[PDB]
Amino acid sequence: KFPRVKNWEVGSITYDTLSAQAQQDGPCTPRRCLGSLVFPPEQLLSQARDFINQYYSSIKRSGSQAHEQRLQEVEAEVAATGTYQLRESELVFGAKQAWRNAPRCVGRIQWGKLQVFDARDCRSAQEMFTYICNHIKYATNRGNLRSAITVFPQRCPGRGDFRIWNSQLVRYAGYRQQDGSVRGDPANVEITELCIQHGWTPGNGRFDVLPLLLQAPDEPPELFLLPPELVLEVPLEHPTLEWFAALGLRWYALPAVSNMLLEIGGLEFPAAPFSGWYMSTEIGTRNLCDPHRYNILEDVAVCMDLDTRTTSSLWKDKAAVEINVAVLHSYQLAKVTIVDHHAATASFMKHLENEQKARGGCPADWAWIVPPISGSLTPVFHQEMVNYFLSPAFRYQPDPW
Amino acid sequence: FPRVKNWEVGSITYDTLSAQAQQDGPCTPRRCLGSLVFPAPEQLLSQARDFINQYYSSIKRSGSQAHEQRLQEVEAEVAATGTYQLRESELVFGAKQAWRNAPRCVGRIQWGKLQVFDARDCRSAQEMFTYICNHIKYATNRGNLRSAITVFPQRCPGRGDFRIWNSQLVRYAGYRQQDGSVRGDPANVEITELCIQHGWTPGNGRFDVLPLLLQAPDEPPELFLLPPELVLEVPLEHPTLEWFAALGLRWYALPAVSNMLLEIGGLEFPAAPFSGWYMSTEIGTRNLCDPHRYNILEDVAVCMDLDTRTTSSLWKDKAAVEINVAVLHSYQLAKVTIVDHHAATASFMKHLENEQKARGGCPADWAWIVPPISGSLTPVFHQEMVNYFLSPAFRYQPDPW
Ligand code: HEM
Ligand code: HEM
Ligand SMILES: Cc1cc(N)nc(-c2cc(CN3CCC(F)(F)CC3)cc(F)c2F)c1
Ligand SMILES: Cc1cc(N)nc(-c2cc(CN3CCC(F)(F)CC3)cc(F)c2F)c1
Ligand SMILES: C[C@H](O)[C@H](O)[C@H]1CNc2nc(N)[nH]c(=O)c2N1
Ligand SMILES: C[C@H](O)[C@H](O)[C@H]1CNc2nc(N)[nH]c(=O)c2N1
Ligand SMILES: [Cl-]
Ligand SMILES: [Cl-]
Ligand SMILES: [Gd+3]
Ligand SMILES: [Gd+3]
Ligand SMILES: [Gd+3]
Ligand SMILES: [Zn+2]
Structure with a gap:
């Protein structure tokens, strides 16, 4: 037992x-x-x-x-x-x-x-926004994340719930097309569609930071533009692949989960x-390289002149490693706290x-x-683990709709 | 459901x-x-x-x-x-x-x-050996594995069990060392001791193919040397890193699990x-890069002139990918069936x-x-699965000693 x-x-x-x-x-x-x-x-x-x-x-x-x-x-x-x-x-x-x-x-x-x-002691989406804004600026701390x-x-x-409608405080827009497919982040097409609905002016870009839909009890959610100076972002460059910056990639500094x-x-x-702060694989592997997310892997491989014609060249693996190198290097250059998957x-x-x-x-x-790249190169791969629920806990919950 | x-x-x-x-x-x-x-x-x-x-x-x-x-x-x-x-x-x-x-x-x-x-209808350990040699010959098929x-x-x-004591038909010896390290494959220290204890004259290389310990019912295990020309092997070289061949690494063609x-x-x-035949990560990632296996990762990364002093250079990820490339290249060069983790x-x-x-x-x-490198680059990572036991089945069983 x-x-x-x-x-x-x-x-x-x-x-x-x-x-x-x-x-x-x-x-x-x-x-x-x-x-x-x-x-x-x-x-x-x-x-x-x-x-x-x-x-x-x-x-x-x-x-x-x-x-x-x-x-x-x-x-x-x-x-x-x-x-x-x-x-x-x-x-x-x-x-x-x-x-x-x-x-x-x-x-x-x-x-x-x-x-x-x-x-x-909070009351109304106006109050939440000032709280969320205090949090973001404290947590960001000019890149020294806390x-x-x-x-x-x-x-x-009997009374409605306080809810943040965005899965995170910083999210990038996902807009559809004259062909269904998404520009920006496909993870957020829904909340992008809910934002545009509730009055937001959509940009055209791949990295438009979404506004917050903040919901006070029993009242309709209210849009809130985040202060652009409060959203710390890192342009992505690579230490030796000079063309990597020209891909225009960016990620935000602060992973702030607001839906649990x-x-x-x-x-x-x-x-x-x-x-808290990011582990580099979250950005460099999942966010940028998942097929249902930014899906950049083949674009980087073409730029690296890799043989995308056969899987056994491991071009996917090579390009993924350099994307992760570019994340770590860019965050360190910006002095934005980040931890690689080996250290983590x-x-x-x-x-x-x-x-x-x-x-x-x-x-x-x-x-x-176990991280999504080089799993067995990290010690947690070789560690057996027991999974179970203790309280207090963070729990998943329905989208407030 | x-x-x-x-x-x-x-x-x-x-x-x-x-x-x-x-x-x-x-x-x-x-x-x-x-x-x-x-x-029962x-x-x-x-x-x-x-x-x-x-x-x-x-x-x-x-x-x-x-x-x-x-x-x-x-x-x-x-x-x-x-x-x-x-x-x-x-x-x-x-x-x-x-x-x-x-x-x-x-x-x-x-x-x-x-x-x-x-x-x-097998009657003795000797007939068992002949059957095994024929298995190996047929399955290897000069590199076109079946x-x-x-x-x-x-x-x-009323009778004891037939048992193959070896975990696979082809295994490299693991010799505990003068200083307490292991020369060869550390996964095989136990079976290596048993072979010596049972009359085998050990070698002292890193890739010494083990003899078979074969047990007929109610019989002590009996030592059998595999005919060297039955055991197809692949010397490991890298398509672009010519120093890689000087590592003297090798692996065998046939993965034949014998203890289940x-x-x-x-x-x-x-x-x-x-x-069957290998998936390249079994060899390139687990067998060669596991800390408790051949553990070549750092030596390869040093030879690659990677910065091994900091984890955020991703030296481990880079050296592992090239070890996997070498395995794939080497088996394709030797015309021995192998599948990469992406195709598999x-x-x-x-x-x-x-x-x-x-x-x-x-x-x-x-x-x-999910492969031990580049997990979320493969489609299985994003696939929920249900794990359960159906019969007929291959089961683990205790080692006969
Ligand atoms: C400070 C550095 C931190 C790092 C590097 C980190 C890392 C991670 C990572 C990689 C995940 C995987 C989730 C995914 O990407 O799908 C995760 C999940 C999660 N983290 Fe952390 N995290 C940090 C801080 C925190 C903090 C401050 C909290 C809460 C106060 C937290 C609570 C959670 C929760 C609730 C999950 C969801 C998984 C679960 O509920 O079991 N983390 N974290
Ligand atoms: C034809 C090519 C094959 C490939 C590429 C392959 C691949 C693999 C891999 C990568 C593993 C995990 C091994 C590990 O890391 O420990 C595995 C496990 C296993 N394979 Fe296959 N295999 C092949 C053929 C076969 C055959 C012919 C059989 C049996 C007739 C078989 C039965 C098993 C069993 C019993 C396991 C242990 C896991 C379990 O029992 O659930 N495989 N295989
Ligand atoms: C405090 C905190 C720190 C940290 N490093 N990360 C998270 C986190 C990040 C996601 C986003 N993440 C994108 C990749 C994905 F693979 F798609 C899975 C979703 C989700 C969560 F639940 C999380 F806790 C939270
Ligand atoms: C028929 C067959 C084909 C194939 N590609 N592979 C196996 C297999 C290979 C191991 C050795 N394998 C080394 C890495 C490790 F990480 F150490 C885990 C053990 C064990 C098994 F049970 C297996 F079925 C079998
Ligand atoms: C402890 C952990 O379960 C263990 O390292 C597992 C994880 N997944 C694996 N997956 C494969 N294919 N082979 C393995 O040996 C293992 N080992
Ligand atoms: C199906 C599978 O459970 C799912 O893809 C999981 C696997 N492991 C993960 N691990 C992390 N850290 N984040 C994830 O989103 C996932 N996704
Ligand atoms: Cl994220
Ligand atoms: Cl093996
Ligand atoms: Gd050019
Ligand atoms: Gd050269
Ligand atoms: Gd040397
Ligand atoms: Zn379970």
Whole structure:
């Protein structure tokens, strides 16, 4: 009942005793594994009790006066109101814990270093925009990126939700054609179509930064043009392929996910944008080279004079590596924090060892931790992993429509 | 029924075949163990009955005279003998299905093209050796490799098992060193010790082909040297890096797995080596670049004049790609069948399509189907998969020592 877990590079063995705490049952059964799938009233008191216990164990204060006291207050609050408010410190502790528990995040070595902007007193898309704008400028920090989350008011019954309609705070437009196919980013054709709908003037380019559709409870979403000086971007050049700059490629500095639902102690925050910094493969491999994204791979290969006529020349692999080199080089030249997939995965192994000693295991999703290029060149490839849901958590949620 | 998405195209299918999954895997709703490498007459009869049902379906004779007669023949044999014997055509069908059902095999587009050598009358380790040599000769075919399996006698009450102790028919020795390192292939240290312990005079090169340790029932293993001219090898050179040939690297033509158990309708064949042809990443990425294998990555990158002091130069990614190029070049130069990871994964996508029409699904282990370099450059990366166990099957089994 405690899964044995082996590292095949070293031969070391550990047991994931933490896996025994998994609540929100995942998608797998003894009969079929679904691990490769991307997207698989007073129970509020069970989750609340549990999270409060987590908080006080963490600060070495389980079973001591303030613990009992806080236990009664959430009981009283829920009894009187049907919900409860998180203490500031608990909101901070729960945000870091949800990050720590995110099985697909390779960057969790950083989980203890997170800036939490408490936006629970927020009201109206106007207010959100100032909060999002404060977050972006703090997190960006002139390229010295700092992990941050901004936590908008929790969901209550009867009243609509706070929601950011964009999957991220920075997104590039995707416009169709007189032939269906997309200019810009095909990942965002829908939210581009929703933006143009709600009044935005579409550009023509491949890298038009989209406006934010910000939604206050029970009110129609409102467009918001992001201050162009607040959107830090990196033009993409290559250190030795002089023509690479002429391809006109760019990516933004700040990966800020704004469509996931933060859940702490039973409370649900459908508006809680978190950001950190990029791993270079996210941009150089997935965003630029996925066939359904910018799909630039063959264009770079033609420019490198590679033999695209046979797959066994590995022209795809060669061009992909240089695109990733160009991402890392461009971000370093712009002094915008970035981490390559070797450094990231090596830090994740350290994180696993840390989490083994601290908690007896770590929820990790092998398919997402192993990077999308050179997988077996990184140590996480050779590490067996156990995937499971702990709370608090970041959860996926429906698009607010 | 699991819904399964391809993210590159957007297409969607349901894996109805997974509902028929007999034996149980390691995952539960609590925790996924997908990344782990190594997760009674009445019950033999129900396995036999299902396979016979499978066989008669494939020959468009479900529910027919011969069908019912074969079921009663098997029940009568299990009653009188505690086991039963496969007809030759049932063995051939069962061997192909076992291949077809192997979830970690990316080469399964070929599953119907398989040469089955019926060695079930094999009497000794000496006859076993002759069968193996003929397998190797046929499958190698002077470099135009043909998929084959040789099936030795089934496990049966009262007698010991036939076993091939070697994990493959062709393996390079791994010699523990004076200083505690390994000369040759570190994956083969154990079997190398066993060969020496069993009378083999070791060499001391890095690419010494191992003898075969072959076990007849209730017999100690018996040492057999492979005729050197039966073992086709490919010296490794790089099309443009002429110093690469000076590494003295080599690999062998034939991948022949010899330590897995073939299960057909509840009958177990502990000795049944099968062989196909290599995908270049197996050699270029895993065998040569794994830290715990030949581990040539840094030496190649240094020779390539890469900056190995910083990870963000992507020296590992660059050197690995050229090691894979060298493998592909070398095998094509030697006229030995090999497939690159792009062609192989492209054919596996067609296999998945074929199997969706044929059986309503396909058991696939995403972490093994996705190549160890350039994962998201191949189509399988963007394909959700359902992993489950179908019989007939190749199973892992303990090492006989
Ligand atoms: C600071 C540097 C960070 C790096 C390098 C990093 C890296 C990554 C990567 C590569 C992914 C894969 C997702 C994809 O591309 O599909 C991911 C997912 C994710 N990350 Fe991180 N991240 C960082 C910070 C953070 C922070 C600050 C948070 C939250 C406070 C966070 C929470 C998540 C979540 C929720 C996911 C989705 C996967 C899941 O829920 O299991 N990450 N991260
Ligand atoms: C014809 C060319 C073939 C190719 C290119 C191919 C490719 C592969 C690869 C890359 C793996 C993963 C190996 C690893 O990294 O450990 C694999 C595993 C495997 N293959 Fe194939 N293979 C071929 C033929 C065959 C044949 C002829 C059989 C059996 C008749 C077979 C059955 C298996 C089995 C049993 C595994 C272990 C995984 C599992 O059992 O699910 N393959 N194959
Ligand atoms: C805080 C944070 C840091 C970081 N480095 N990255 C993310 C992140 C980035 C995506 C975008 N990503 C594009 C490539 C893709 F492969 F298409 C999959 C989607 C999605 C997420 F959920 C994420 F958490 C978040
Ligand atoms: C018939 C057949 C064809 C083919 N291309 N390959 C295999 C195969 C090869 C290994 C060796 N392979 C080395 C790399 C590794 F990463 F170490 C993992 C093990 C093991 C297996 F089970 C296999 F079926 C079999
Ligand atoms: C089908 C498969 O699960 C899907 O393509 C996953 C695989 N691994 C991934 N890993 C990361 N980091 N990001 C992703 O989007 C994906 N996609
Ligand atoms: C621990 C991890 O599961 C292990 O390294 C796996 C991952 N995927 C693999 N995939 C293939 N094709 N071959 C392998 O040996 C492995 N090893
Ligand atoms: Cl992104
Ligand atoms: Cl091999
Ligand atoms: Gd020119
Ligand atoms: Gd030269
Ligand atoms: Gd030297
Ligand atoms: Zn699973």
